Amino acid sequence: SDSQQSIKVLEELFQKLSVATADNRHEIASEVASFLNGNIIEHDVPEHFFGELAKGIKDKKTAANAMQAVAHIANQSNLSPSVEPYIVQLVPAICTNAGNKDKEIQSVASETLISIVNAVNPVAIKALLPHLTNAIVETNKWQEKIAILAAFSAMVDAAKDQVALRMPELIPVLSETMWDTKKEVKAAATAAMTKATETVDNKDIERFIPSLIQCIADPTEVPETVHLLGATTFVAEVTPATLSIMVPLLSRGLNERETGIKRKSAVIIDNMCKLVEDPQVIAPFLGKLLPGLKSNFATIADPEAREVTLRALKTLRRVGNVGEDDAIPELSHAGDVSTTLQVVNELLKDETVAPRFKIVVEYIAAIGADLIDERIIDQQAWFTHITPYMTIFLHEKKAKDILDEFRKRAVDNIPVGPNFDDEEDEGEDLCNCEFSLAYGAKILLNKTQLRLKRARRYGICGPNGCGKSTLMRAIANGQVDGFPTQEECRTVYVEHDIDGTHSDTSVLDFVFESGVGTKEAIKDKLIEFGFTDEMIAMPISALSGGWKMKLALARAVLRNADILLLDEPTNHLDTVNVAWLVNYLNTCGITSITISHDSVFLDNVCEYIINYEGLKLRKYKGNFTEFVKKCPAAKAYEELSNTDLEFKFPEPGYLEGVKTKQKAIVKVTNMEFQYPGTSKPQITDINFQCSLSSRIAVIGPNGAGKSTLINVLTGELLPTSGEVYTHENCRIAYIKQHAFAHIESHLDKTPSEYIQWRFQTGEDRETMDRANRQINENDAEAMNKIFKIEGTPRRIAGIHSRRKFKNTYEYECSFLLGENIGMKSERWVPMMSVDNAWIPRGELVESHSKMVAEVDMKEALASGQFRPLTRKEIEEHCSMLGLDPEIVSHSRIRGLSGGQKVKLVLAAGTWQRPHLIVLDEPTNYLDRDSLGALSKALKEFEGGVIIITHSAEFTKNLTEEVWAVKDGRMTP
C-alpha cells in the first residue's frame, strides 16, 4: 500500500520529467533519483516506470530527459542495488544515443555512460563490459566509439582489479580501434589504451609501456622495441594483463624477418613465461607463440638461435602444461558467466521467478562469476555482494540459504593448480633433500623434498602445531636426511645458542669465547654493526632486545654463516629495530629462513614460502601475501593477517549541555516532505526525538513514506516544512551496504588510505550529498554556474562560513554580479559584503565542492570537532573495530576477508565518533556471524541507535522504540 504509493509517485515524477526542459531537467532528474534509490518497493520493481524510461530513451523528443534522469539515478554514492540491474540493461540503448546526429542527445549519452560506469558495483563488471565491447565493435558511428572508449577509461579507475582480469579481452578491442580510419577515433583509442595499461601494475616492464603502445600503432617499431626489451629481467608474477601487452609484440617478433630478432623474441618469451605460475593464465596466449616457435626451431641455421627457441618452446609447453601433439589444455570455465548462471538457474528451479526479475538473475550470475576470477570465496563476501540483489524477488532466509549453496558450488569449480617446479629456479642449491621427519615417534613430514637456493629468503608456514620449529631445529642440527654438513653449509640458529657465560662477562669476551676469531676481528665487526666502544666493553646482561639481535647477527657474519634461521625474530623488538632487521635481511646477501606470526614482517622479507600441507612441504614463489592467493587454507592459520574477532564502536564525541543520555540532541516537530510535482506529501505531521540513549527501530514494509522518512533523517532530503532542532556538533553515521560492496574499487590501498580517501574533503563522501551527482571534479568551467539571487545573475566569488539549516548546512557566499550578459563587454564584477547570501549545501557541492570542503574544514576546527587523519589515530580507531595496527598501515585491502572488510567499512563509517548510528537494513547483506558481532556492539554503543529493518528477530533485545509510517504519517 505505502509501496503501491511509490508506484504512483514515480508516475507523477516521470510525467513531469518527460515534459522537462533543459532548464528544469536537472531539478526533476534529481527528484526521481533521490526517490527511486530509497527503500520504496517491497520485494518488487517499479516495472512500468523502467518501461517508460526505456521507451523515452529511444525517442528524440525525450532522449535527453530520460538519460539525464539515469545519470542522476546512477550517481557515485547512492545507486540502489534494487535499481542497478535495470540501469545497466539500458546501456545498449544509451550507446546508440551516443552516436545520434543531434548534439544534445549525443552529449548527454556520453555523459550518462561515464556516470553508469562509476556507479555500478565494480564486481558486476561482467554484466556491463560486454555491452560496451559489443557496441563499439558493431557501430559505424565514430562519435559512439569515442564515447565508449571514454567509458572504458573511466572503468579503469572505477574497477582497476576487475578490469585487470579483463585485459586479455579488452586489449585486442582497443588495438583494433587504434586502427580506425577516423583520426579522432585513433586519437581516442590511443588514449584509452594508455589508460588501460595502468592495470598492468608490473614494475619490470612499466617503463616500456609507452614503447609497446607505439608498436601496436606501428609494427615497424617492433624490431626496435624487441631490441629495446631484451634486458628486462623479470621478477614479479606474469599476470593476464602482462601477457595481453607483451605477447602481441613478441608474436610479431617471432614472425619477423631478421634472425637476430627471432632469437631475441624467444629470449624474452623464455625469460618471461617461466614466471608463469598458472597454466590457465598462459593458455589463451599459447596459440600466438607456439606456431612462431615451431616454425623457427626448424628454419634457422645458427645453433644459438635454435637452442634459445627450443628453450622457449620447452618452457611454453611446461608452463602451459600443454599435452601431447601440442594441444592446449581445456580452459576452466569456473569464472564464466554462462557457468555461474547455470548454477543459479538450477538452484532457482523450484522458485517461480517472474519475467521482470530475469535481468536480476543475470546480474547475480555476473557478480558470482567475477568473485570467482578474483578468487573471493568466503561466505561474508558473497552475502555482501549478491544477497541485496536476491531480496528483490526472494525472501531473505530463502535468498541466504540459496546464496550459500550457490557459492559452495561455484567455488568447487575452481581448478586445482599444480605445484612449484624444483628443477628450474636460479642457482647452486645450498641443499636438495628427499626426506621424512619424526619427532618422538610422531611423523611431521613423510617422503617430502626440501631444496634451498643460495642468497634466497624463505618463510615457513603451517597450521599451529604442525612442526615448524622442529623442522628448523632439525635443519639447525643437521637431522634432515641429505642436508650438507656444517663445514659445507654453515647454519646459525639466531638467538637460540646456549652457553655458560657469566652475566658479568663483557660483550667482547662473550663473542670471543665462541672461538670465532681474535678480539681485534671481533671489535672490527661489532663496530661496523653499530656498536660503540662503551657497549663492546659492557656486560652482556645490559644489552637490550634490539642489541642482542644485532649482536647475534654480527656473530653470524663472524661464523661465516650460509643460512640464518630465525624463529619469531620480531618478538620484544620495537618498530625501528624491526625495520632495521628487515633492511639487514634483504641486504646481507645470505639465505635466511623465518618463522613468524607477523605477516607484515614475512611480506617484507620472504621471497618464497615453504608451507606444511599434510605431511608434505610445498613451495610457493612470493611473500606471505602472494602465498595466500595460491593457497586459501592459509587464511585459517595463526598469522597476523588471519586474526579476526568482535568489535566495539567508539564513544561518541563530547557534547556540551548534554548531562543525561535521555536529553534530546535531535528533535523534529510538525515535519513534512513533499516532492515538487507530487499530488500530496510523502510524509507529514512528523514528530520525533533522538538521544544518546535512543534505541529506535524503523519497521514496516518498504514504501513512499518510510523511505522518505529515512531520507529526511539522514540528511539527504530537506524538509518542505516543519522545525528541526539539532544540538550543535551532532553527528550521524549512516551505514548502508553501498560502502561494503564498493570498497572493492579500493583493493589497492591500505585500510588507512581508504579511510583517508573517504574523508578527503572532511565529510564522509559515501553518505554526504547522496542527493547530488558528485561526479563533478574536472569541472573548471562548471564553476561558472550561475546562481539566481534577488532576481540577479551571479557566480560564486567565495564561501566564507557555515551554519545549520534544519537537517543540513547553509553557506555564506560572496558573489560576482553579471553585467552586459551576452555582449562583447560582458563582465562579472565582484559584489560587496552586503550582498552575501546563505546558500544550501545541495546547491553548491556539484559546482563548488572544493570551496565547500575548505569551509567545512574551518568550521570543524573552530568547533574543536575535527579529528586528524594521522596513521596513529586511524590505527587506534581501527583497533576498536578489531583490526590490527600493522595490517591497517601496511597491508592492502586486497588481502582482507569479507568479514575484515566489514570491520574496515564499519570503522570508516564511525570514524568521526557519531552520536547516532543509523543502520540501513543490516541483515540484508550480513551473515549470522557478522550479525552477531554487530548486535553486541550495538547493545554496548554509548550513543543513539536507529536500525531500519524487516527482521523482528534482529530488533528484539536491541531496540525499544518503534517508528512506523501509515498513510504518510507516524507516531513514536
Ligand X SMILES: Nc1ncnc2c1ncn2[C@@H]1O[C@H](COP(=O)(O)OP(=O)(O)O)[C@@H](O)[C@H]1O
DSSP 332: -
Told to check if 823 binds a second copy by CB under 8 A, we report yes
Min dist. Cβ of residue 397 to ligand X (A): 5
Residue 218, binding choice from a second copy, ligand X, none, Cβ under 5 to 8 Å by partner class: a second copy
Grid cell in block for residue 641: 593477517
Residues 232-271 that bind a second copy (CB under 8 A): 233, 260, 263-264, 267, 271
Grid cell in block for residue 258: 631478421
Vertex 119: Cα angle to 78 and 785 (nearest 5):
80
Min dist. Cβ of residue 790 to a second copy (A): 22
Task: Using the structure block, give the residue that is written with the C-alpha cell 526505456.
Answer: 54
Residue 82, binding choice from a second copy, ligand X, none, Cβ under 5 to 8 Å by partner class: ligand X
Between 82 and 190, CB nearer to a second copy: 190
Cβ–Cβ under 8 Å, residues 429 and 453: yes
3-state SS record for 631-689:
CHHHHHCCCCCCCCCCCCCCCCCCCCCCCCCCCEEEEEEEEEECCCCCCCCCEEEEEEE
CA distance 793 to 770: 27
Residue 837, binding choice from a second copy, ligand X, none, Cβ under 5 to 8 Å by partner class: none
CA distance 161 to 200: 10
Report the 10 Å Cβ neighbour count for 625: 18
Cβ–Cβ under 8 Å, residues 82 and 431: no
Min dist. Cβ of residue 700 to a second copy (A): 37
Cβ–Cβ under 8 Å, residues 201 and 241: yes
Between 391 and 752, CB nearer to ligand X: 391
Between 352 and 518, CB nearer to a second copy: 518
Min dist. Cβ of residue 390 to ligand X (A): 8
CA distance 539 to 554: 17
Q: Is 26 annotated as a binding residue?
A: no
How far is C-alpha 276 from the chain's CA centre? 24
Told to check if 545 binds a second copy by CB under 8 A, we report no
Q: Is 391 annotated as a binding residue?
A: yes
Between 386 and 593, CB nearer to a second copy: 593
Residue 276, binding choice from a second copy, ligand X, none, Cβ under 5 to 8 Å by partner class: none
CA distance 969 to 688: 12
Q: How far apart are the first and last CA of the chain?
A: 21
**Burial 176-210, CB ≥16 within 10 A → b, else e:** ebbebeeeebeebbbbbbebbbbbbebebbeebbe
Residues 845-874 that bind a second copy (CB under 8 A): 850, 854, 857-858, 860-864, 866-873
Residue 923, binding choice from ligand X, a second copy, none, Cβ under 5 to 8 Å by partner class: ligand X
Q: Is 784 annotated as a binding residue?
A: no
Min dist. Cβ of residue 945 to a second copy (A): 20
Told to check if 515 binds a second copy by CB under 8 A, we report no
Min dist. Cβ of residue 954 to a second copy (A): 31
Between 598 and 920, CB nearer to ligand X: 920
CA distance 550 to 494: 10
Between 395 and 939, CB nearer to ligand X: 395
Q: Is 41 annotated as a binding residue?
A: yes
Between 38 and 168, CB nearer to ligand X: 38
Grid cell in block for residue 847: 559546482
Q: CB under 8 Å to 594, separation ≥6 — which residues?
A: 457, 458, 459, 460, 566, 567, 569, 585, 601, 602, 605, 606
Q: Is 48 annotated as a binding residue?
A: no
Give how many residues touch a second copy by CB under 8 A.
110
Q: Is 118 annotated as a binding residue?
A: no
Told to check if 225 binds a second copy by CB under 8 A, we report yes
List, as own/partner pairs, every contact residues 929-936 make where C-beta atoms lie below 8 angstroms and the sequence separation is at least 24, other chains included.
929/379, 929/380, 929/899, 930/380, 930/383, 930/899, 930/902, 933/646, 933/647, 934/906, 936/646
Q: Which listed residue (11, 47, 224, 835) binds a second copy by CB under 8 A?
A: 224
Between 558 and 817, CB nearer to a second copy: 558
Can you spell out the DSSP letters for 357-415? GHHHHHHHHHHHHHHHHTT--SHHHHHHHTHHHHTTTS-HHHHHHHHHHHHHHHHHTS-
Told to check if 464 binds a second copy by CB under 8 A, we report no
Min dist. Cβ of residue 696 to a second copy (A): 25
Q: Is 94 annotated as a binding residue?
A: no
Told to check if 512 binds a second copy by CB under 8 A, we report no
Q: Is 642 annotated as a binding residue?
A: no
x/- track of binding to a second copy for residues 784-813 (CB under 8 A): x-------------x-x-------------
Vertex 920: Cα angle to 738 and 15 (nearest 5):
75
Between 516 and 931, CB nearer to a second copy: 516
Told to check if 827 binds a second copy by CB under 8 A, we report yes
Min dist. Cβ of residue 588 to a second copy (A): 5
Q: Which listed residue (44, 47, 172, 191) binds a second copy by CB under 8 A?
A: 191
Q: Is 131 annotated as a binding residue?
A: no
Residue 557, binding choice from a second copy, ligand X, none, Cβ under 5 to 8 Å by partner class: a second copy
Min dist. Cβ of residue 385 to ligand X (A): 13
Between 543 and 558, CB nearer to a second copy: 558
Min dist. Cβ of residue 803 to ligand X (A): 36
| Closest C-alpha to 664, from 689, 635, 634 | 689
CA distance 915 to 651: 8
3-state SS, residue 829: strand
Q: Is 924 annotated as a binding residue?
A: yes
Can you spell out the DSSP letters for 192-210? HHHHHGGG---TTTGGGHH
Q: Site residues (CB under 6 A) for ligand X? A: 41-44, 82, 388, 391-392, 395-397, 701-702, 921, 923-924, 950-951
Told to check if 210 binds a second copy by CB under 8 A, we report yes
Q: CB under 8 Å to 31, separation ≥6 — which residues?
A: 13, 675, 676, 677
Q: Which listed residue (25, 314, 318, 454) binds a second copy by CB under 8 A?
A: 454
Residue nearest to ligand X (CB): 950
User: Rg of the chain over CA atoms, in angstroms?
Assistant: 32
Min dist. Cβ of residue 80 to ligand X (A): 8
Please tell me the total number of residues recorded for the chain in this structure. 972
Between 624 and 925, CB nearer to ligand X: 925
Between 202 and 924, CB nearer to ligand X: 924
3-state SS, residue 755: helix
Told to check if 275 binds a second copy by CB under 8 A, we report no
- Amino acid identity, position 163: V
Cβ–Cβ under 8 Å, residues 753 and 924: no
List, as own/partner pairs, every contact residues 379-382 make where C-beta atoms lie below 8 angstroms and the sequence separation is at least 24, other chains included.
379/404, 379/407, 379/898, 379/927, 379/929, 380/897, 380/898, 380/899, 380/901, 380/902, 380/926, 380/927, 380/929, 380/930, 381/897, 381/898, 381/901, 382/406, 382/407, 382/898
x/- track of binding to a second copy for residues 638-667 (CB under 8 A): -------------x-xx-x-----------
Between 30 and 570, CB nearer to a second copy: 570
Min dist. Cβ of residue 577 to a second copy (A): 11
Between 332 and 889, CB nearer to a second copy: 889
Min dist. Cβ of residue 822 to a second copy (A): 6
Vertex 684: Cα angle to 682 and 689 (nearest 5):
115
Min dist. Cβ of residue 150 to a second copy (A): 9
Q: Which listed residue (138, 324, 426, 499) binds a second copy by CB under 8 A?
A: 426
Residues 912-931 that bind a second copy (CB under 8 A): 913
DSSP 833: G
Residues 87-146 that bind a second copy (CB under 8 A): 146
- Per the annotation, binding residues for ADP are 41, 43, 82, 391, 395-396, 702, 921, 924, 950
